[PDB]
Ligand binder design. Structure first.
Ligand SMILES: Nc1ncnc2c1ncn2[C@@H]1O[C@H](CSCC[C@H](N)C(=O)O)[C@@H](O)[C@H]1O
Ligand SMILES: Nc1ncnc2c1ncn2[C@@H]1O[C@H](CSCC[C@H](N)C(=O)O)[C@@H](O)[C@H]1O
Lengths: 336, 336
């Protein structure tokens, strides 16, 4: 069976969930085979080669659709589920609280959220800590607009948003706290990224990074072989990197580690499951919302298939071996 | 059975090798049970707690005996065995060559060897690189004397030895290369140690560290429980720390990592096996050598039992799971 053939049936909704999940799990299984080495000697050689290679490098969905698919604050990162019955809205809030705890946020601090998305964390910190000034930075005008509208509705006076490609942003401004929640995976050059972040810190600042990871090895999110129809469908341009849980420890030229955690992958699995189920529940509404801006029922079905498959695939990835393969890494740093 | 009882039979040579190896393997087995956590979340919590705890802290055998037990240069660190038939003398040289390769030694450099022991590496570099100046640093007068005698016999003019407790040594001198071969395991405060080493480097220097490790977790070399007669017999004062293979990545306040390797534990296992077998072969001579300085056959038997048991135990430790538990970690750093 060719890619063309599988992609044919997928787009037509002719692959049932059972088969789809099975096919994607197999693809992730091959990545694990690729990544695990027989000895720690070989594992470190593999991992350091990856790390060295990084050092050589360098239409938007309507907000109504996003609201029908994601949780209340449209968080687009792994959330944290205390209970079986925890809702996605509760899991968003719990995840925001965990970041505030681990990044040691205190009232009165200046806070920068890099790649802030729809601004759930910016709005959380602004509401919880009235004397903080909170700045989100995003490369999306639509996201900036959404955040400023929400801050207005919430009567928040302590929020601003920088519209910038972070890789190009130049400023003399420093911040007490810099937060990077699942943004670093999108970064082309990571030695240069951490260096830039360090110039926006003082000796009193902390930097908190959260990134999807594998516990043992790093990889680009790209086709494992010629049979892999999934990876390139999800990221057809690519430029998503899955660092190992310890990869950023090798990027301490300009910052120094203070603490290090991981969150088991079942939290991410439950996040993507909640998105998939909500999209499914709101399927008719979603198709209605998208149609104006996409111009045909076929183009709508395509966008929806892509998002739904991303959630179905993410479920297999992060739930693999009960959350003990792909998971979320978190690190706290100070400036050199 | 009490410790007193096992120690009774051990000292009397009443425990055969088979039983001795079995008992020590069991003790290491319990350490593995202690150290491996069920989830990566818990493994990192365990490992970071250990790392944080470190940040809060702060008669000699005649040379003729050492010559009868160890290899030609009296190396007292893991060696490197290419073949089944590689001799300890060859393995010493191979290990010296590996350090020179990984620490990027070049003729003309100033080189400092911290905790240089009987000076095998100092003498190797001095002979191979005639324009290097090579300084060994040791806290032992007997070791200093041995090295200077060997340098004289070898017609080396480029060797000096500092007699100092490294934790107390103050100097303005800097070096192109600093080498630390299985010395850091003896260090009380490691943030402070790496900081001190950094003040002896310039922007052009490199630091190479080799340390015994476990691939997954860190531990002090101390009794696992009340049944453990071994750990405290080997190190009755203690102050040996077995860092995980990645522990020093968290000690980059003052230096920055460039490369990272591990060497499989079978190399160390073959090293301690060679020492044990050579001591066994030369047992009569060894007892004769020690008697003058120890003053009784009983005190001689004690010293020999301690050294032999150390080798028997080391064999079980490093050969465990074909060298994939305890092994040797190596790191290359530059100054911040
Ligand atoms: N170069 C760049 N400059 C600014 N933002 C960028 C960027 N590359 C990616 N981003 C943004 O970073 C975000 C990563 S997704 C995570 C969004 C948000 N932190 C949340 O947790 O929900 C996306 O909004 C992405 O478009
Ligand atoms: N505070 C200190 N100052 C100097 N040397 C020390 C020290 N603590 C331990 N040492 C020495 O460091 C050495 C560790 S054993 C390794 C010796 C040598 N590098 C080799 O590979 O053979 C021992 O000689 C030990 O006595």
């Amino acid at each position: 069976e060719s890619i063309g053939e599988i992609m044919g049936k997928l787009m037509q909704g002719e692959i049932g969930d059972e088969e789809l999940s099975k096919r994607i799990k197999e693809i992730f299984g091959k990545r694990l085979q690729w990544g695990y080495k027989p000895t720690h000697q070989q594992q470190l050689a593999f991992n350091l080669d990856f790390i060295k290679s990084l050092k050589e490098m360098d239409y938007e969905l309507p907000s109504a659709f996003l609201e029908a698919a994601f949780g209340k604050t449209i968080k687009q990162s792994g959330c944290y589920f205390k209970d079986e019955t925890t809702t996605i809205d509760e899991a968003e809030e719990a995840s925001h609280e965990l970041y505030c705890e681990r990044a040691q946020i205190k009232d009165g601090q200046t806070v920068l959220d890099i790649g802030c998305g729809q601004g759930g964390l910016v709005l959380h910190i602004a509401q919880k800590y009235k004397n903080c000034h909170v700045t989100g930075l995003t490369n999306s005008k639509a996201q900036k607009n959404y955040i400023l509208m929400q801050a207005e509705k919430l009567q928040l006076s302590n929020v601003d948003v920088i519209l910038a490609d972070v890789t190009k942003h130049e400023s003399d401004k420093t911040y007490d706290r810099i937060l990077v929640i699942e943004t670093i995976e999108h970064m082309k050059n990571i030695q240069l990224f951490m260096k830039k972040l360090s110039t926006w810190m003082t000796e009193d600042s902390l930097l908190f990074v959260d990134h999807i990871c594998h516990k043992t090895f790093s990889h680009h999110f790209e086709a494992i072989d010629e049979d892999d129809w999934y990876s390139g469908f999800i990221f057809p341009k690519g430029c998503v990197t899955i660092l190992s849980a310890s990869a950023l420890l090798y990027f301490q030229d300009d910052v120094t580690i203070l603490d290090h955690w991981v969150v088991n992958g079942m939290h991410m699995a439950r996040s993507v499951d909640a998105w998939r189920k909500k999209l499914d529940k709101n399927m008719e509404l979603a198709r209605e919302i998208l149609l104006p801006g996409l111009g045909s029922k076929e183009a709508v079905n395509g966008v929806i298939t892509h998002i739904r498959t991303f959630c179905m695939g993410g479920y297999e990835q992060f739930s693999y071996n009960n959350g003990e393969e792909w998971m979320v890494a978190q690190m706290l740093f100070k400036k050199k």
